Design a protein around this ligand. Structure first.
Ligand SMILES: N#Cc1ccc(O)cc1
Ligand SMILES: N#Cc1ccc(O)cc1
Lengths: 324, 163, 324, 163
């Protein structure tokens, strides 16, 4: 859809953007969001690096599921064809004071606007998909582009990586510095005569060790609706996520810490430390955010069944998966 | 001074379960287990469900010795999380065409041999639909299987998860 | 006092510290604080850069006035001889949840511990007093020290800078890049023979223009207990200050935006944008944090009369200074 | 593209007041004002209070022409925020020994001249206790004075603050 964008700003070098009643602009340090509420224009600042990492995830994930929060004021709720953009709406205090605003959007329009924002606000010196130790600053005046980091083209996984008609392995990528000790050996495949290329196996740890992005579940095996979506996590999950289905985490290397709270209240429910080999169900009625000091291998196990929202709303699926 | 990189992997011989710290509510809700503890306390090749989502399963297998021949009507996948497993593949003459979940293929499956794969830790292979496959393990290891709840899947949540 | 420190950690290179029931440690990315509450150990991660900047202020200001909040969990409260260290106690939700804890310390013991933490945790690469654009990373493993930056010292103002035996001027300091356009002209002092050095005047703007730290109110004129404490602001005030008395801000250059919240809740109350020449009272019952895109010049006006807080605590004085 | 640095200062001829957005509460409690708007709407050297803290005050004065002679029992301070102001000093033979706040020193103050100081924008001078002093401005200017509430201090909060 048609993006509403201004001329580059005379001082900062950046364009402001309009999306329905929202105004998005950035300066040398902050993204700034404005919106109407009770007759006045309301504003909110978010540090530009925090903002960009968050929007980068929202764009790469296609708005994910449930509530993707940039911070405790700004967020989106994917409605699977339409996406709500909200400010303070899911914030007890702002909501009670009636200074919040929400507006609904056809996915392609908000997506186009968002891609355009990343393009414009991401300088050549900053990669929104990387951990801080891996990249430069998002701060300062407009200064080049980083298309290569924000437009990562990916062949979708049909079955498994490495298959001929499928998503490629990563032998042409450097091992990340925090996985430099991980074996790079491939499994041995021994095809019986007349069966060359009928058997398939690759090194998942090697494949992960060569991941060039953080907090990005990517499909590595497909069993009907069941998807294995491993990802390498460093620093902090760039958003806090409000769930709308049960999620499963299997921690494969190192450790991650999850703050788990009330989707609406924000009230603490649990603090989960996941170590190598741990398996955890994240319930459909919480929100959470992860912390991973060392780049670690996390398996996110997804379920791509279309009527999930119906199942949870109906009561066919409880907020937590297992009674025992 | 210290510049070493240590990617911590666990094993059957050496693992440290994480922790669920409850502020409010019940640890039950998080179905929290650890695949190494699980394999450590299970029979060889008992397919222990450690994740369940609308009938899709993640199973943990203790690889020790030689498994039964397995088969399914759809694709499955195996990740070797510890040890070293050899996986033998037969292309069945008469593959299961319908149904879900891994099934016993029988003592002597009828079909051409396709070969085998040698999986070490961190390695993944496809378990193609309409094939029979068998696991070989000289030393105790751990296999993660992605599949669908079936006749062989064992549930024992109260035994394996925090409560 | 005698700080309780561990040996350096075999991997991170950092020491950990014990202050009563509080344990304070850091790794490559996060400072970690644990404490007892509701029969168990509770924990909280704060990015090492954010933590160090806040700790730096608390130590330079000798714990300041009232509440100094590192973030929405950790903070200190000055009793002017004794200091509380807390976790969650001034967060309405955490307190409601009963996971908060407060412990009381003699000022010398906590000050010695905080100074040790600052010294141990600040790498040669990181200036906890500067803006993010003015310094490097606080992340990674132990790597040198930055004594020159954490152990700044200048003479306390007695009457006014530039006077005999008083606090110095800054003619020996470089003009900060973001004040490069500020006049460096002094005022003309024409003394009448027999009266040399009896008249005193300087360029406050020149003075601030050469300030080498951010968010650090510093006395430039003393009128009984009335103190003028200007400072140069960039990025975000590294803490949320909770008032124990009334203060006033006079914006002298550019702009700053203030989030105003409840002192005891942390709950939002107002958003104040202060432009050049603006004058604002910050009531004794709020907390606040500022945002300044360009390094700006701010006058912070304090009343240093002793025992003021009791008058506010008791209700004898209203939280706001003036009824009209 | 742009690498210029523009430190924004305001003046009588050019000023833009900020804003108080309320979520819960009253703008009133912030006593929010702008010194340049206050000087623009005030008599010459009318000591307008823009800050009050339990007896201590910050006064805004519109510098236009010559002020009366002022004096006080305790130190005071002036900062020039707009224009040029020349401050004359007089070491009185009989300084005020008691009381607070700036008082009128009279038409013909008795004492030895001490000299003068020339204050442009951003300059600050000491107004030493027991001296008398006065301001001279060819061009309209603005002075901030740090002192104590006295007989000359003018309060007009409902006029200068956001309601
Ligand atoms: N929820 C969620 C989530 C998203 C990305 C990721 O890498 C891990 C967890
Ligand atoms: N209150 C308060 C405060 C503390 C430091 C600073 O730079 C500005 C305001």
């Amino acid at each position: 859809d048609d993006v509403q964008a201004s001329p580059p700003h005379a001082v900062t070098g950046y364009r402001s953007f309009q999306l329905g009643a929202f105004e998005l602009s950035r300066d040398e340090y902050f993204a700034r969001i404005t919106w109407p509420a009770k007759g006045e224009t309301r504003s909110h600042l978010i540090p530009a690096d925090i903002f960009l990492r968050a929007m980068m995830r929202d764009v790469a994930w296609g708005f994910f599921y449930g509530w993707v929060n940039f911070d405790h004021v700004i967020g989106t709720r994917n409605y699977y064809g339409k996406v709500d953009l909200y400010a303070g709406t899911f914030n007890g205090t702002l909501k009670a004071a009636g200074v919040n605003y929400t507006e609904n959007f056809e996915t392609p329009l908000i997506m186009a606007t968002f891609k355009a924002i990343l393009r414009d606000w991401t300088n050549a010196t900053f990669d929104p998909f990387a951990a801080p130790e891996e990249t430069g600053s998002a701060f300062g005046r407009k200064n080049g582009e980083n298309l290569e980091c924000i437009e990562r083209f990916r062949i979708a996984t049909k079955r498994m990586p490495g298959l001929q008609d499928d998503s490629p392995l990563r032998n042409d990528l450097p091992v990340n510095r925090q996985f430099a000790d991980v074996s790079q050996d491939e499994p041995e495949v021994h095809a019986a005569e007349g069966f060359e290329g009928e058997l398939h196996a690759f090194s998942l740890f090697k494949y992960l060790s060569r991941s060039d992005v953080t907090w990005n579940p990517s499909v590595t095996s497909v069993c009907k609706a069941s998807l294995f979506c491993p990802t390498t996590e460093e620093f902090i999950l760039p958003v806090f996520h409000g769930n709308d289905r049960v999620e499963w985490f299997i921690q494969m290397s190192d450790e991650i810490v999850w703050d788990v709270g009330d989707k609406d209240d924000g009230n603490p429910r649990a603090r989960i430390t996941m170590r190598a080999g741990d398996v955890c169900a994240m319930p459909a009625d919480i929100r959470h955010q992860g912390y991973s000091t060392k780049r670690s291998m996390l398996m996110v196990w997804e379920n791509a069944t279309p009527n999930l929202p119906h199942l949870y709303e109906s009561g066919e699926l409880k907020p937590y998966p297992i009674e025992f | 001074s210290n510049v070493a990189v240590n990617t911590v992997f666990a094993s059957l011989d050496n693992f440290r379960k994480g922790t669920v710290e409850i502020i409010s509510g019940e640890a039950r809700h998080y179905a929290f287990s650890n695949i190494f503890e699980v394999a450590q306390n299970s029979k060889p090749y008992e397919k222990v469900v450690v994740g369940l989502n609308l009938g899709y399963v993640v199973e943990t297998l203790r690889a020790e010795g030689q498994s039964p021949w397995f088969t399914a009507a759809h694709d499955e996948f195996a990740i070797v999380m510890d040890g070293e497993v050899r996986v033998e593949f037969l292309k069945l003459d008469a593959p299961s065409k319908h149904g879900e979940g891994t099934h016993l293929a029988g003592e002597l499956p009828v079909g051409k041999p396709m070969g085998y794969v040698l999986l070490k830790r961190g390695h993944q292979c496809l378990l193609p639909a309409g094939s029979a496959y068998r696991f070989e393990a000289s030393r105790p290891g751990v296999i993660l299987q992605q599949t669908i709840k079936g006749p062989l899947s064992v549930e024992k949540w109260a035994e394996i998860c925090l409560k």
